[PDB]
Each structure stands twice: as structure tokens, then as C-alpha cells.
Amino acid sequence: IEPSLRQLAQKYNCDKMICRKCYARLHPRAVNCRKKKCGHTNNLRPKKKV
Amino acid sequence: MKTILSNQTVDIPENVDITLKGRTVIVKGPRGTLRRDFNHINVELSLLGKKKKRLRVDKWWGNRKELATVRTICSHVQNMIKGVTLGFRYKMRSVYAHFPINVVIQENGSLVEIRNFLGEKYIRRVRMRPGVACSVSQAQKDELILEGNDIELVSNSAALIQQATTVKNKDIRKFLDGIYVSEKGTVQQAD
Amino acid sequence: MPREDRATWKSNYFLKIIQLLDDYPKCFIVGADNVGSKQMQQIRMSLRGKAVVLMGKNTMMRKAIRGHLENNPALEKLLPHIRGNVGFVFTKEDLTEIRDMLLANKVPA
Amino acid sequence: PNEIKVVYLRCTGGEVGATSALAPKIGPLGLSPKKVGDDIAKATGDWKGLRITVKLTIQNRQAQIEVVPSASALIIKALKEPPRDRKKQKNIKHSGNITFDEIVNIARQMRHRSLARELSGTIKEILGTAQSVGCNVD
RNA sequence: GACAGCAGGACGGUGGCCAUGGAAGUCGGAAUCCGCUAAGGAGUGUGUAACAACUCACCUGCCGAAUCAACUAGCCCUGA
Ligand SMILES: [Mg+2]
Ligand SMILES: [Mg+2]
């Protein structure tokens, strides 16, 4: 299962920030949902671990 | 606030020889030649220096968005100069669970054919870009190396591979399966 | 941090550098890559007796001795100065024996 | 030849080695009972109890449990009677007054490691170190 | 000489202290001083169940001129 490769796959699919209003996956450092459908809010939450 | 003449400084090394016919940039080097078309950008391009090959990218007036634009030309000319000297190399370790993933190169380095992909029966035939080669690397478990000149084409190929390997209707925090980009680098090392 | 505060923030280093300014001929230009372990005491303890080793930010020390010089010379320790982690044991002792003891006497010795 | 350096096995209050540990002395080495039963049997009688150093410094086909301590064990040593508790006796608080000189008499066999001068060094360091002793010498 | 970026560290009296279930700053508790300095928080955390590399706080080099934080109102967008 190779935990370094697990770190790589979790880097590509786990540690993202999810916006509470637009529900889009963004980036681990991002502050704002880039979508027009909510309008660039600063309302986020981290993506849930197992 | 309608600024004036922002200018970026692009050094050019000794091996490569640049030649522009307008906003169309044509670069020659050891690893093939290269060109792009910057027509829609409306920025003064000029070069100065007898065999020193300094390039300046100059935009007058503008807006804040266009002062943001004037650095992007500098960065793309930097990436073209890195490519035409060295070339870009993407190293991808395939991460597989209880099912293996078989990856073959079907014809001449262009076509990539992915199999067995979580036990799916569907053979996944993916067509890469023109101007880029792909090889299963040696001395490492299921590492796949893509080599090319234009970084947009090479990384679009890598994106096509990692979006060909995408898990449907499951958790994607479990089922961490796919072919992902692990390392970005140059063709010739130590440079 | 309000300039001097007469406390130990900014112009106490700019009291020590400029008040240990009239006791020496020969800043010595000791520089080490890392001192995180007991290397700190390896700098001071072996060179005690005449134990000094004081220099803060080289960014602080750009116009510092220039504006508060009044010593004419020893500003020929100019732009060869800033660069590199330099500790400055400014001394008053005999000849090169100081540098000789340091030619190795902290990191492997 | 068959010699090895220290491991610092302590945090115990008895002697001999926290149990009858003079039988499992053999193992992944070739040592022998040379200082597990005589010098520790005197060292408990000399500097009895209170979890000092006592490391294993094997030199030639034999053990060597020669004790080389430093501070905070040598300032927990500031006592005149150990009326033992054997466990759990209300966490017995030996916060005891020390005499006027912990400066030249309780520091001289302990020094060469404070990395300073003498008078501004070890003397002033042990006063900041003593967190079980503090009853104000004055 | 900030601001982010690259480079260096991130101690010692001191395996300090509550414990001996670990704790040698890393689940928890009281606290908390000082020295060396360029600065280290009797240590933000990563991670070995624990020992350890490691980072953060804090500090120094290359750098070059504006940068950061709140708050307000015009247009536009979300709300629709
Ligand atoms: Mg389901
Ligand atoms: Mg509207």
C-alpha cells in the first residue's frame, strides 16, 4: 500500500479545502471559492479525514 | 491607474538563438525548435545585446490586469528556454491497491494503453499529444516517464492520464488508485 | 523596538556595538554554518578569557558604524562584510594565534 | 578490545540495579560481574538512593558501573536523613533548607560542565535549577 | 532593509518539573527562571504505541521598495 505513495495520493485527493456554500474542491491554502455560483466567499472548511 | 512601460528582463543563455517576427516567438536550440503565438496580448517585444541576447518585454499604459499580463510573457519565454535547452520530464509512480495496473505503450511512444484498473474490463486507450514521448521507466516499480519539449503539451498529456484514471461512485479517500504525477524535472540532469 | 527604550531590544545592541567600539584594533571575522548544538559554547568557552563574539544583523550593520563612526578607519571592512553568517570576535590580544585556535577548534575539535 | 560506552540506566531508588539485576548482566555482550555487586554495594552506602547516574562502562571482559553524576541529582542529595516511604506516602515533600555554601562545596566535584566562568556560572545555574530544594537559603 | 521567496539553525543548567501508564520539549496537570547569544518559546506541531530525525515560534544571510491589517462607498457579480 506504500505509505509514501499514500502520502502522494492523499496529496492529490484529500488535503483540499471545501467551501460550505459552493461545495467545490479548491486547494489547501486557498481562501476563496473561485466559482461565480456562490460569489467568492471566504467561508470554507477542511476536507474530512477517515 | 494607467501606469507606464512596465518592463520584464529575460536573460537568454549562450546556446539558444532567438528570432521573432512580431508577437510570434520562434526559439531554436539543441533539442529541436519551438514557437508560440502571443498575438492576442498587445505587448511590446524587443531584444538587445550583440550576442548577449537580453530580451525585454515592455507594456505601456495598461491596467492592473495588464500589468498582471506583462509577467506571463516573461514566464512563458522562460519555460520555452528551459524546454529548448533541456526538455521536460514527468515521473509518475502508479499507485495500486490489491489490483495491479498494467500500462503499455501501444504505438511508437504516442499511444498509452491502461489495463486492469481495479478489475475493470474496459481497456482504456488514451491518445497523447503530438511532440511528446512516453516510456515505462526501468529500475523502479511502475514508474512512467513522459519526455517532451513544450511544457503545456507534456503536462496536458499528464493531466489526460490522471483524468483517465479516475474512480467513479466510490469514496476517493479510500480507493486511492490512479496514475499520478510524482516528480517534475528536466531531461538532462544536474542542469 | 521603540528605538532604544533603554532596554535590551534594538539600541542595546546599538549600545554594545558602539560602546565596545573604543576598545579594539582587529575585528575578527569568524563564521560558522550552524551552531544549534553545543557549538555555541564551543565558540565561547574555548576562546574565553578574552571572550567576545558579538554581531547581530548585518542588515542592522549597514549604515550603523557609518553614522556612528567617529573612528575614521575600520570602515574598510565594507561590502566584503555583510554577506555570510559572520560572528565578529573583535579582539585585543597577540597575533594570528586567535585564528589558529579557530582554524578548527569548535566544530570537529 | 571488548569495551563499550555508557547507556545511563537509572530512575530507581534502591541499589544493585533496581532489582537483583546481577543475573541478567550477560546478553548481547561478554561482560562479567565486576562492579554490579561491590562498587554499587558501597555506592548505595555512600550516596544512598535518589536516582543518580550509574551508567554501564564495560572495559575488559567485565562490567563497570562506576558512577559519574551531575546537578539536580546532587541537589536532590541535599538531605541529612532518608526516612523511606517505599511507595505512595503522601508524595513526601523534601523541600529542605540548604546551608550558606552550595557554591564551593556542593559544586566543585560537579563542575566542568556549566560552560561559563566559575562564580557567575555553576553557582548561579544551580539556583535556577533547584526546583525541589527551594526553601530560601537567604 | 520589512514583505513573501531560496539558505542556516531551532540549544543549554536540563531525560528541569505531575508521574514511573509513557513523556528524552510531542495524549493530559501545575507552571516558567536564567545563561549563550543572532535566538530558541523549562518548547506550535509533523510523526515511532514510546526513543529519534523534522518543523513552528524565535532568530541570520541573498534581496530591493513599498508592504500589512482593519474599515468604508461607486460599478459589477452572488443572493435571484
Ligand atoms: Mg456508495
Ligand atoms: Mg443585478
Strand content of chain C: under 5%
What is the subunit organization of this protein? part of a larger assembly
Bound molecules: magnesium ion
Count of extended strands of chain C:
2
Range of helix content of chain C? 10-25%
Work out the helicity level of chain A: 10-25%
| First-residue to last-residue Cα separation of chain C | 38 Å
Tell me the strand order in the biggest sheet of chain C.
1-2
Task: Give a quick account of the main beta sheet of chain A: strands, pairing sense, barrel closure.
Answer: 2 strands, antiparallel
Structural class of chain C: mainly alpha
The largest inter-chain interface, given as chain pair and residues per side, is: A-B, 13 and 12 residues
Portion in strands of chain A: 5-15%
Total beta-strand segments of chain A? 2
Compressed to H and E, one letter per element, the order of chain A equals HEE
* Radius of gyration of chain C from CA coordinates: 15 Å
Shape descriptor of chain A reads elongated
H/E element sequence of chain C: HEHHEH
What does the model show?
The structure is cut from a larger assembly and holds chains A (50 residues), B (191 residues), C (109 residues) and D (138 residues). Helix content of chain B is 19%, strand content 36%. Chain B is of the alpha+beta class and 191 residues long. The two termini of chain B are 41 Å apart. In chain C, 7% of the residues are buried. In chain D, 15% of the residues lie in helices and 0% in strands. Chain D is built from two helices and no strands. The chains are: A alpha+beta (50), B alpha+beta (191), C mainly alpha (109), D mainly alpha (138). Chains in contact: A-B, C-D. Chain A binds chain B through residues 1-2, 5-6, 8-10, 12-14, 48-50, and chain B through 93, 95, 97, 162, 172-174, 176-178, 180, 182. The structure holds magnesium ion (2 copies). Chain C binds one RNA strand of 80 nucleotides through α2. Chain A: Component of the 60S subunit of the ribosome. Ribosomal protein L40 is essential for translation of a subset of cellular transcripts, and especially for cap-dependent translation of vesicular stomatitis virus mRNAs.
